[PDB]
């Protein structure tokens, strides 16, 4: 292999990137979006606030422009993500009652039905759990509709698209801690009881020098449960500017994360939330931090580059 497409390729598994599809007309971003990715998940353009700004008006413009490239290079499509309570608008904030409810349901119908049969897999449900276990805090969704909105989103997303993979996404979930627990109670649940759910995927928003050990072990569990697991958004970011300890420091972790998908085999593949450092989310909201991605600011491979390849086995 001589890119990470061919690595994981070789290895039967996806490696994905999230794309901002306006960045598609700079050339060397497309090059490498065409060149080293078998997977596409779009990074905003299939959000609430990017697909349905007012009730019932939606603007696929985005999220089209996303499936397109994925369809015209070959990719597998990811969905991101039908519920969130993050970024929603404020319309739909001002709801309450049945009447967020039938916005949230009509809201998942309409975004998985025009992606039918383009999207492979969903992130139906995002964010659900809080950090220490339990039920996340300062969700809209949590807050009007409670503990039964995500049982009605997965299944308002399985009668639209009867094929889709449908995920339940979250971060600091990694490791085996409360809030992990809270979501296995949660997919135990529901396949014992035959809620529509397919998958789990496992954000990895990591920071440099602190991957979590047991991660395969948390993994391997969740397969268990009869359910795929993915690595969703993995970056790894640390205090800028980089040298040459933090870069190896990061190479080591990328290796960790993608080994430990590699040792379970219903682990997807890995996608990572970007493709340079020069576009990453890090900066802005983590002052003093970034360098977070495969690719710096100039797109040059960072030693995680070698490290992604390695671990996938090429
Ligand atoms: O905040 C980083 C990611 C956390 N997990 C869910 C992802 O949707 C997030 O992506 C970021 O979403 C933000 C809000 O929509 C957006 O401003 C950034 O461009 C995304 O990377």
């Excluded at 603007?59 to 597998?76: I, M, N, P």
């Excluded at 889709?164 to 979501?183: H, M, P, Q, T």
């Excluded at 890995?270 to 340079?276: A, E, F, K, P």
Aim: aromatic share 10%; charged share 25%.
């Amino acid at each position: 292999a001589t890119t990470l497409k061919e690595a994981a390729d070789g290895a039967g598994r996806d490696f994905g990137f999230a794309l901002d599809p306006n960045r598609l007309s700079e050339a060397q971003y497309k090059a490498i979006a065409d060149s080293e990715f078998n997977l596409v998940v779009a990074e905003n353009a299939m959000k609430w606030d990017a697909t349905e700004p007012s009730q019932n008006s939606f603007s696929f413009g985005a999220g089209d422009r996303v499936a397109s490239y994925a369809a015209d290079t070959g990719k597998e499509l990811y969905g991101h993500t039908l519920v969130w309570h993050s970024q929603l608008p404020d319309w739909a904030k001002n709801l309450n009652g049945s009447a967020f409810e039938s916005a949230m349901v009509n809201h998942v119908t309409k975004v998985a039905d025009h992606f039918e049969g383009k999207v492979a897999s969903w992130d139906v449900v995002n964010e659900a759990f809080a950090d220490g276990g339990g039920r996340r805090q300062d969700s809209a969704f949590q807050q009007k509709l409670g503990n039964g909105y995500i049982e009605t989103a997965f299944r308002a997303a399985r009668a639209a698209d009867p094929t889709a993979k449908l995920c339940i996404n979250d971060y600091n979930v990694e490791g085996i801690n409360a809030k992990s627990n809270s979501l296995y109670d949660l997919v135990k649940d529901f396949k014992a009881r035959g809620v529509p759910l397919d998958c789990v995927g496992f954000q990895s928003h990591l920071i440099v020098g602190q991957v979590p050990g047991d991660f395969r072990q948390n993994l391997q569990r969740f397969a268990d449960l009869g359910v795929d697991v993915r690595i969703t958004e993995l970056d790894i970011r640390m205090r800028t500017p980089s040298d040459a300890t933090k870069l190896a420091t990061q190479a080591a972790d990328y290796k960790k994360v993608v080994q430990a998908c590699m040792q379970v085999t219903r682990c997807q593949g890995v996608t990572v939330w970007g493709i340079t450092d020069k576009y990453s989310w890090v900066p802005d909201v983590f002052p003093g931090e970034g360098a977070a991605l495969v690719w710096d600011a100039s797109y040059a491979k960072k030693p995680a580059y070698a490290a992604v390849m390695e671990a996938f086995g090429a």
